[PDB]
Amino acid sequence: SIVVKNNIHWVGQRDWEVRDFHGTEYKTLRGSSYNSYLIREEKNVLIDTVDHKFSREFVQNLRNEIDLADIDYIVINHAEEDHAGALTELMAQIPDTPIYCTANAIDSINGHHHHPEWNFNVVKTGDTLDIGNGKQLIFVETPMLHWPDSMMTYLTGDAVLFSNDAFGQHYCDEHLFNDEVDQTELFEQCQRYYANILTPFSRLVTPKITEILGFNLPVDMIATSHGVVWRDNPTQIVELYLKWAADYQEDRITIFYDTMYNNTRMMADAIAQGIAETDPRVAVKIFNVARSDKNEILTNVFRSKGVLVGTSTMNNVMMPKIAGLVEEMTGLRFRNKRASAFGSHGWSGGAVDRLSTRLQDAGFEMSLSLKAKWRPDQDALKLCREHGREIARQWALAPL
Amino acid sequence: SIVVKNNIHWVGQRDWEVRDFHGTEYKTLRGSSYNSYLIREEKNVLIDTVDHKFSREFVQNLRNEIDLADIDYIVINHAEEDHAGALTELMAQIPDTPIYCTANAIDSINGHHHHPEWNFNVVKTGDTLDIGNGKQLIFVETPMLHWPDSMMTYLTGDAVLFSNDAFGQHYCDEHLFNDEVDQTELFEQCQRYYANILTPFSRLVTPKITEILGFNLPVDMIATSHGVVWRDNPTQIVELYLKWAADYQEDRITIFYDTMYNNTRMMADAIAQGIAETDPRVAVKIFNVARSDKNEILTNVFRSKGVLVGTSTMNNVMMPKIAGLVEEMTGLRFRNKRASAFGSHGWSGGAVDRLSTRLQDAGFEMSLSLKAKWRPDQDALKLCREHGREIARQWALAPL
Numbered sequence: 001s002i003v004v005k006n007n008i009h010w011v012g013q014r015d016w017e018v019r020d021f022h023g024t025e026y027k028t029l030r031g032s033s034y035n036s037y038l039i040r041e042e043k044n045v046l047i048d049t050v051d052h053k054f055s056r057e058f059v060q061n062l063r064n065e066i067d068l069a070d071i072d073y074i075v076i077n078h079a080e081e082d083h084a085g086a087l088t089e090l091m092a093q094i095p096d097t098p099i100y101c102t103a104n105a106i107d108s109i110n111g112h113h114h115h116p117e118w119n120f121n122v123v124k125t126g127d128t129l130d131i132g133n134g135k136q137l138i139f140v141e142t143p144m145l146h147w148p149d150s151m152m153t154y155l156t157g158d159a160v161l162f163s164n165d166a167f168g169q170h171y172c173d174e175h176l177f178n179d180e181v182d183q184t185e186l187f188e189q190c191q192r193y194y195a196n197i198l199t200p201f202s203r204l205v206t207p208k209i210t211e212i213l214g215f216n217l218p219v220d221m222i223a224t225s226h227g228v229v230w231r232d233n234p235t236q237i238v239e240l241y242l243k244w245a246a247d248y249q250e251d252r253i254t255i256f257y258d259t260m261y262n263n264t265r266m267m268a269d270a271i272a273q274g275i276a277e278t279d280p281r282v283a284v285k286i287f288n289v290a291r292s293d294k295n296e297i298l299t300n301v302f303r304s305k306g307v308l309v310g311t312s313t314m315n316n317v318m319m320p321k322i323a324g325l326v327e328e329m330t331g332l333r334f335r336n337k338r339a340s341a342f343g344s345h346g347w348s349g350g351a352v353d354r355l356s357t358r359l360q361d362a363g364f365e366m367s368l369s370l371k372a373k374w375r376p377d378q379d380a381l382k383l384c385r386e387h388g389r390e391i392a393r394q395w396a397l398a399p400l
Numbered sequence: 401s402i403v404v405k406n407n408i409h410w411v412g413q414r415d416w417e418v419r420d421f422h423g424t425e426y427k428t429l430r431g432s433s434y435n436s437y438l439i440r441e442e443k444n445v446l447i448d449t450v451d452h453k454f455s456r457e458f459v460q461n462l463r464n465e466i467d468l469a470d471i472d473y474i475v476i477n478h479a480e481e482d483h484a485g486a487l488t489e490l491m492a493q494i495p496d497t498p499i500y501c502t503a504n505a506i507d508s509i510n511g512h513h514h515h516p517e518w519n520f521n522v523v524k525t526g527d528t529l530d531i532g533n534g535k536q537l538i539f540v541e542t543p544m545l546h547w548p549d550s551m552m553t554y555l556t557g558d559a560v561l562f563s564n565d566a567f568g569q570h571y572c573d574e575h576l577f578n579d580e581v582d583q584t585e586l587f588e589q590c591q592r593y594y595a596n597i598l599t600p601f602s603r604l605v606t607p608k609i610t611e612i613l614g615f616n617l618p619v620d621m622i623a624t625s626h627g628v629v630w631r632d633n634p635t636q637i638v639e640l641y642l643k644w645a646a647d648y649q650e651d652r653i654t655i656f657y658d659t660m661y662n663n664t665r666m667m668a669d670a671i672a673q674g675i676a677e678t679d680p681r682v683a684v685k686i687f688n689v690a691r692s693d694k695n696e697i698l699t700n701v702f703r704s705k706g707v708l709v710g711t712s713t714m715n716n717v718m719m720p721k722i723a724g725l726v727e728e729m730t731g732l733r734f735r736n737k738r739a740s741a742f743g744s745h746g747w748s749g750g751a752v753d754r755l756s757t758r759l760q761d762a763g764f765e766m767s768l769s770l771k772a773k774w775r776p777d778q779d780a781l782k783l784c785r786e787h788g789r790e791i792a793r794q795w796a797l798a799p800l
């Protein structure tokens with residue numbers, strides 16, 4: 001274990017190896033950690049657990065810290081596999097230990113573990129749990145941030161906000177605190193996490209933060225369920241979350257596509273040239289969805305004012321990886337972003353129009369599409385380059 | 401080179417390494433070959449070329465066989481990259497050599513190579529090209545089998561049908577003829593090819609074969625553009641194509657899904673049990689689309705009377721790999737097949753209904769969906785098992 005502050009002990013698990021989250025839809029290229037906390041005051045309180053893969057390690061490590069029978073309360077901020085996976089193993093040893101969680105958490109905990117006989121205590125925003133020595137826990141409901149059952153737990157005196165998933169990131173490191181790790185890598189993992197997971201709930205982020213700020217609770221540390229404990233200027237990640245939630249965009253355009261004979265790739269590169277020579281302020285990124293990291297593509301979409309998506313026509317429809325990515329973007333609900341579909345075809349085509357419609361269905365404001373037949377010659381490449389110019393002029397944040 | 405028959409020389413290229421075709425949408429697990437043929441009678445005729453990766457090897461190997469200036473005619477059955485990729489390199493040495501192809505091939509050849517100054521000769525069904533010694537080429541147009549430009553070339557006397565893509569397969573072997581290779585592996589690669597490439601054009605296969613049969617042309621060998629030369633009972637692959645084109649299905653059900661916490665997987669396995677204990681005649685296959693070979697999944701769909709597709713709800717939509725696969729199936733146009741969508745959800749769900757609709761859009765006859773919340777308990781697994789029973793009864797090819 002590691003001392004977070006005073007009697008707050010980190011009893012979690014580092015994961016140097018993990019690469020796949022949520023099936024294979026989130027790639028953790030820098031590993032992750034599953035943060036669990038044991039508070040030892042007059043009462044002993046366990047906050048969350050860890051991923052099911054480390055269930056036996058978690059309980060054994062917990063035994064080394066404390067007699068399991070001496071644990072008074074268990075707090076479940078969020079009943080996802082990677083935080084509540086070792087719960088069954090733990091409750092098998094101490095089945096009478098009370099669990100404090102939201103009403104929705106009773107449904108999600110019972111939904112996986114199938115042990116409704118456990119002693120649940122529904123908490124709502126403002127509810128308190130005294131743990132002695134003048135300290136108490138204050139619970140804050142945060143539904144759909146990012147699950148119906150989600151909440152945060154605040155510890156008075158020590159002024160530590162146990163935020164669970166919120167403000168966390170998938171970043172594995174031997175050091176626990178934010179000021180002890182690589183700042184660039186930390187930011188990248190934080191932004192990657194928000195972009196790929198929290199984007200659809202951005203409308204809920206600012207009101208909830210505003211609500212919490214109204215509570216006037218001092219914050220010395222933010223202890224999340226993933227990655228570092230924020231202790232040095234801890235509200236920096238809160239400020240980032242406020243920025244990211246406001247339909248975030250930079251002067252940036254992301255271009256991605258799939259291609260069978262590189263015809264659409266040729267179009268994509270020419271489009272990029274047209275943009276770059278029209279608006280020097282715009283940053284451009286290009287990805288082949290079949291050869292690139294999907295989560296990196298989505299992080300760039302999140303960062304972009306607009307996107308261009310390319311596909312050739314394959315059996316009268318679009319290429320499947322493009323269809324898959326557009327479906328996923330539809331779920332993420334990007335806002336105030338623009339889009340244009342492009343691609344090559346052999347005869348009757350149709351995938352470009354089909355893609356433009358689905359981009360619109362995903363919530364993008366659509367500009368005109370760009371089409372070409374077979375491999376673009378010099379004349380066709382000029383048209384693609386002109387398309388990039390036209391797009392750059394239209395999507396300009398400012399004149400010229 | 402290798403002697404196919406008499407003065408017909410195989411001047412193609414084996415590809416032991418290739419794993420990706422059409423971007424990454426076709427996995428060639430047993431490599432492939434690109435078959436090109438040089439006929440040396442009174443006239444010298446080159447039939448097709450090879451993939452662009454082996455362009456320099458192709459021309460050099462061709463030089464070792466014949467003075468390039470002595471090549472009289474070039475026949476392009478089909479102007480796809482993997483057959484016309486070395487054409488530019490070749491025509492750079494012999495630019496005056498006439499090219500015989502369909503009208504649509506002029507558009508596809510010029511579409512990639514951008515050399516309209518080449519000497520094209522449009523051929524249509526029944527047209528002939530005398531090459532001396534009492535032998536002639538007879539051309540047969542086969543539009544949308546599988547490209548607009550596609551055709552076949554028949555050589556009289558030797559009775560060899562140069563079928564290009566048709567009846568071919570991605571199977572790399574040192575031996576050239578069908579009777580010299582592993583028969584099981586040959587069948588598997590043949591069926592994999594038809595299922596993943598030719599399925600949407602099945603309605604065109606039987607009429608074209610019937611037309612060709614009416615020509616009463618003797619067939620000693622079928623020399624395709626991929627894999628083996630059919631010399632021993634060569635029409636066996638034609639008979640397979642007739643079977644496969646007739647909305648082919650076996651008493652088989654394919655189940656595939658994606659899952660984040662294995663909840664949908666649990667449903668899939670229970671569904672399979674219900675099927676197996678209801679109808680012993682049905683063969684069942686189960687795939688996780690994120691962990692399986694996509695082309696194998698599609699080959700099984702092709703072989704199946706029906707499918708069940710699983711997804712959990714992810715940000716109010718379906719999992720992207722499932723969305724991608726359903727798009728691809730929409731393009732393949734499977735016929736006379738049934739489907740049922742299933743999956744787990746956390747709260748409001750919606751992906752199962754969404755998937756059922758898109759399966760219907762893909763052309764499947766839909767049965768009722770199966771839904772469950774979080775991880776299925778014993779009661780829920782009984783319902784899933786009952787769903788498999790109900791599906792097995794409904795999709796029964798015969799009573800009981």
Ligand SMILES: Cc1cc2nc3c(=O)[nH]c(=O)nc-3n(C[C@H](O)[C@H](O)[C@H](O)COP(=O)(O)O)c2cc1C
Nearest residue numbers: 260261262263264312315316344345346347348349
């Ligand atoms: C398997 C396959 C299916 C195709 N289906 C269509 C089609 O349905 N309609 C069409 O216009 N072109 C079709 N084409 C032609 C491609 O769209 C054309 O080659 C395009 O220029 C390739 O673009 P890309 O290199 O970006 O993949 C198909 C090509 C392949 C290889």
Ligand SMILES: Cc1cc2nc3c(=O)[nH]c(=O)nc-3n(C[C@H](O)[C@H](O)[C@H](O)COP(=O)(O)O)c2cc1C
Nearest residue numbers: 660661662663664712715716744745746747748749
């Ligand atoms: C990233 C993520 C997003 C989710 N979005 C939804 C949703 O929008 N609606 C819903 O009902 N459940 C949602 N869920 C809950 C899952 O559908 C639920 O956990 C389901 O039982 C998982 O099924 P699986 O194990 O087959 O993936 C979401 C879960 C995750 C991890």
Ligand SMILES: [Fe+3]
Nearest residue numbers: 082165225226
């Ligand atoms: Fe988490």
Ligand SMILES: [Fe+3]
Nearest residue numbers: 482565625626
């Ligand atoms: Fe081919």
Ligand SMILES: [O]
Nearest residue numbers: 080082083165
């Ligand atoms: O999580």
Ligand SMILES: [O]
Nearest residue numbers: 480482483565
């Ligand atoms: O091909």
